[PDB]
Design a protein around this nucleic acid. Structure first.
Lengths: 262, 149, 141, 129, 151
RNA sequence: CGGGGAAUCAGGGUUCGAUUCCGGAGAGGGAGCCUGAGAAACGGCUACCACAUCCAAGGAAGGCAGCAGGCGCGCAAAUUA
RNA sequence: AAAGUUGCUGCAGUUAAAAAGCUCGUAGUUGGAUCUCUCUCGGCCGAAGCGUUUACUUUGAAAAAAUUAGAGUGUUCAAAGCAGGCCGCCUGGAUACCGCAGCUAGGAAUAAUGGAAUAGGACCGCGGUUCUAUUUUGUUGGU
């Protein structure tokens, strides 16, 4: 190429968007924003494919630029605006609130939340640095810079932040025995408590996590988002509680649900 | 089978299972060692030392009665030649055949046997230089043959 | 005997490479001289211009006189001799007609009956000999 | 010259048992030979054997039974990963019931079933059916 | 002085050689402070780098390089260049058609710091990846061990 | 052009991958720039080479390996919707 | 593809294609038997040296979709598709494979490799020589 790309082919789109093959040759191509291209759900896919208020992209544009959709309390009219993990979507006209968090299968669940839960969000701290005139700054996973954080907050810790103002309100350390959710890799969407973090200098750390059913799985340190302190999550969880069922028990649950109703 | 002779004999020595020294041998290990010392002073190779000790002094195996084999015994007090006895015998044989060739030029069999002997010399010298018995600069030359004897 | 050493892959590869070069189908398909010397240029059919009409004598145990066309190919200027299915079909062929020609059928090999012919006439004047011989189509001039 | 004494032992056992013999003498002994013969013995193929100790590499006298058809070595000792076993047995054992690939693994000398059970691979030595 | 063998003045850029000192310090000892650091991956900075006098901007311990990326090994094969050596890495490549192996090799030109003396042909060298230092060198010597057969 | 891949299929292999996805390269052949965050850009510019359009003979303009379409080439491939 | 007529699996070379007059003779390939975890600082444990290094084997992480295999679903069936189903509600959009190489943590059979025999070899203590303590000479000059 001679410069940056503007198009996303539909088969080359992220698979967890759940787009089909025959609607077009193109996928909605997320704008630049606080989330990566491969780790976000654009607003057009949310309002059309998942939530089904709209039937076309033109109807998505008509919804969005009537100024109805807030992402983290800010009105967005970009139809391809990249929304990602822990982002709060508020529709004040229909009175709906959502958090973009993952299913046990690694797809952004339609997770409805309470309007008091939509006041805040959680962020994973990605860097701590001191800037000019000795002013400490943190940078989160969603491109937020906060000046003057708590001196106890470190990288990989999780801040509980207020969307009305944007300041630090509470925080959770990275420690063995805290609750976490996996935001990348093969264990995307699973939830469990951290049991062992092994360190590899000059390389990636590997965190071992144990499920509430006793299953154990490892990930990298980049894929760990600490959610709750010890055992109780600080946000609402989806219908599955991070418990990945195997295909056998999922078939059994489907058959029992078909037997009970019908 | 042999290296270069196509014949494959069996004749060798069969050591008995009994490693213990027999009771009738009243000689001690020390007296065996000074027997080795006089025998080496008489200008004897280790093979001849073992042969005379077996034939006359009743020593079945020096390694069974003294705990070491004869070359190590000669090496402890330095009564050991610079180069081993098999290489020495190949070199003497090469000098003898070469002198016969100098007298007799129509003996092509002696020329072929000389090639065979020199091939043995080269292979065994390679082996010894691998195990540091010979210095790495040592080489067999046809003219540097009578000086080693 | 062949070597079976676990660290002998390079020797096995080199030997198989040379011994593949001793295979005649491999040599034809990979050396390339078979396709440079082929009159068809490696293709399945070829168009030509009919130069003359000749008669080639058949084999000795089944004596006959078969009739052939001497045709110069268009794309390389090579001369070949092509077979006509019978003498009735030859009356549709005249000197200077554009003729589409295929191979005889045994993959580059000549006939077991007619010595030294490898090509058969398929079309003349953009109509097939089967359509002319069956009265399905007529040819222009 | 005499390389791969396990090959020579297995060839001697096969040749003696095809002539309908009751005992076979194999020399020289080896620990790999003894573990291979133990693997055969625990499956009831070669009766019971005895090691004769001279102060050299010893000899083994094996009391042949008759249930064996062919025992064989796979030379060289190919690396056998835990998947390749099915491939290897479909190349070596004429059926799914009887026949044995013997593996030298980090857990010792075993057959392919016990190799699967302990979840490991190794290097292939031989087979007997 | 075994240091100023070039046409420009060789010095470590981080140390200052013109401190204004008293006469008693002048008559005390004439030793320059030396800049050194650790290649921190369990690699020990050698004493010949800490107490030495040489100037090498491409030295891992006293220069201006950082070690990040791969860490490999080789055997020293040629030592005829200036502050760089040519090592050899041997390996086995698996041809899966034959299920066999062939032996292959790669030659690698690495920078040898002056703090490693008595480096012989055949000794095992551990190199770490740095930024490009010349056209063909990308790795930098971090450890030397002698061959196991040599006393 | 390379891969993802395709045919076969007991297994190993053998043949194919110009071609819709990913990466690269090029815009007749070379070369050099301007502008711009980004191009050594060709549905930008400036030369030379090869072709080639108009002309009142002074001059001016060019680049379908984009969509259609044409000629040529050929055994070989669609509508100027 | 039949084809074991390119043969690693898996071919042949007396008489049919084909083994060299004979011996010596680099490299490469291949090579008999044998050998059954700990020390410091911090809360039974964590850091550290590893134990000769490998080759080998296993685990863990990480690894585009499409295609392939494969789960669900009466496209009227099917090739397909990713849908749908029930009287607003209830669901899906699984899963496997993903050589090699490289990271990770185990295994020690197999096969190399090394560790003392001119002993300037281990384990202890007694040490002598040289360099060297960052502090226990309130603040300091210190031989």
């Amino acid at each position: 190429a001679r410069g940056p790309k503007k198009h996303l082919k539909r088969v080359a789109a992220p698979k967890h968007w759940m787009l089909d093959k025959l609607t077009g040759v193109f996928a909605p191509r997320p704008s630049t924003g606080p989330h990566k291209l491969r780790e976000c759900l654009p607003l057009i896919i949310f309002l059309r494919n998942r939530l089904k208020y709209a039937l076309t992209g033109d109807e998505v544009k008509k919804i969005c630029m009537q100024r109805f959709i807030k992402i983290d309390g800010k009105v967005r009219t970009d139809i391809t605006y990249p929304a990602g993990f822990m982002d709060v979507i508020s529709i004040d006209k229909t009175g709906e609130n959502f958090r973009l968090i993952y299913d046990t299968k690694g797809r952004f669940a339609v997770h409805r939340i309470t309007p008091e839960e939509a006041k805040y969000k959680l962020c994973k701290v990605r860097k701590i640095f001191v800037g000019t005139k000795g002013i400490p700054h943190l940078v989160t996973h969603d491109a937020r810079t906060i000046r003057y954080p708590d001196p106890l907050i470190k990288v990989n810790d999780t801040i509980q932040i207020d969307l009305e103002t944007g300041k630090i309100t509470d925080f959770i350390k990275f420690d063995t025995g805290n609750l976490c959710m996996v935001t990348g890799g093969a264990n995307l969407g699973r939830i469990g408590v951290i049991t062992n973090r092994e360190r590899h200098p000059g390389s990636f750390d590997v965190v071992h996590v144990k499920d509430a059913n006793g299953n154990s799985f490892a990930t990298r340190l980049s894929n760990i988002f600490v959610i709750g302190k010890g055992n109780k999550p600080w946000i609402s969880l989806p219908r599955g509680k991070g418990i990945r069922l195997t295909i056998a028990e999922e078939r059994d649950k489907r058959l029992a649900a078909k037997q009970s109703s019908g | 089978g042999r290296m270069h002779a196509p014949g494959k004999g069996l004749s060798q020595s069969a050591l008995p299972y009994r490693r213990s020294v027999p009771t009738w041998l009243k000689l001690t290990s020390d007296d065996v060692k000074e027997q080795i010392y006089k025998l080496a002073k008489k200008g004897l190779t280790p093979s001849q030392i073992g042969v005379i000790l077996r034939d006359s002094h009743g020593v079945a195996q020096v390694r069974f009665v003294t705990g070491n084999k004869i070359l190590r015994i000669l090496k402890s007090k330095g009564l050991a030649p610079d180069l081993p006895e098999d290489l020495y015998h190949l070199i003497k044989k090469a000098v003898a055949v070469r002198k016969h060739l100098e007298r007799n030029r129509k003996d092509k069999d002696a020329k072929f046997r000389l090639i065979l002997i020199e091939s043995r010399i080269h292979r065994l010298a390679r082996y010894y230089k691998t195990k540091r018995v010979l210095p790495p600069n040592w080489k067999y030359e046809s003219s540097t043959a009578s000086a080693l004897v | 005997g062949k070597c079976r050493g676990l660290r002998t892959a390079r020797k096995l590869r080199s030997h198989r490479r040379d011994q593949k070069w001793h295979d005649k189908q491999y040599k034809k398909a990979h050396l390339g001289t078979a396709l440079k010397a082929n009159p068809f240029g490696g293709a399945s059919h070829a168009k030509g211009i009919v130069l003359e009409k000749v008669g080639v004598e058949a084999k000795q145990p089944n004596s006959a006189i078969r009739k052939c066309v001497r045709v110069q190919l268009i794309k390389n200027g090579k001369k070949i001799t092509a077979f006509v299915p019978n003498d009735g079909c030859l009356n549709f062929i005249e000197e200077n007609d554009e003729v589409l020609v295929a191979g005889f059928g045994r993959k580059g090999h000549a006939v077991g009956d007619i010595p030294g012919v490898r090509f058969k006439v398929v079309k003349v004047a953009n109509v097939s000999l089967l359509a002319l011989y069956k009265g399905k189509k007529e040819r222009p001039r | 010259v005499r390389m791969n004494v396990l090959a020579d032992a297995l060839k001697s056992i096969n040749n003696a048992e095809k002539r309908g013999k009751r005992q076979v003498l194999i020399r020289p002994c080896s620990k790999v030979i003894v573990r291979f013969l133990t693997v055969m013995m625990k499956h009831g193929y070669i009766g019971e054997f005895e090691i004769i100790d001279d102060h050299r590499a010893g000899k083994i006298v094996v009391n042949l039974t008759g249930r064996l058809n062919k025992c064989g070595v796979i030379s060289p000792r190919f690396d056998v990963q835990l998947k390749d076993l099915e491939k290897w047995q479909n190349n070596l054992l004429p059926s799914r019931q009887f026949g044995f690939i013997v593996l030298t693994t980090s857990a010792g000398i075993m057959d392919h079933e016990e190799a699967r059970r302990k979840h490991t691979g190794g290097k292939i030595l031989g087979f007997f059916f | 002085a075994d240091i100023q063998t070039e046409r420009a003045y060789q010095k470590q850029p981080t140390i200052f050689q013109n401190k204004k000192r008293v006469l008693l310090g002048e008559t005390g000892k004439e030793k320059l402070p030396r800049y050194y650091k650790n290649i921190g991956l369990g690699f020990k900075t050698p004493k010949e780098a800490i107490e030495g006098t040489y100037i090498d901007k491409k030295c891992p311990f006293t220069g201006n390089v950082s070690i990040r990326g791969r860490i490999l090994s080789g055997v020293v094969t040629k030592m005829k260049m200036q502050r760089t050596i040519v090592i050899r890495r041997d390996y086995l490549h698996y041809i899966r058609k034959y299920n066999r192996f062939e032996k292959r090799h790669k030659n690698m030109s690495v920078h040898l710091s002056p703090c490693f003396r008595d480096v012989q042909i055949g000794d095992i060298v551990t190199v770490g990846e740095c930024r490009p230092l010349s056209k063909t060198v990308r790795f930098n010597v971090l450890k030397v061990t002698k061959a196991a057969g040599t006393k």
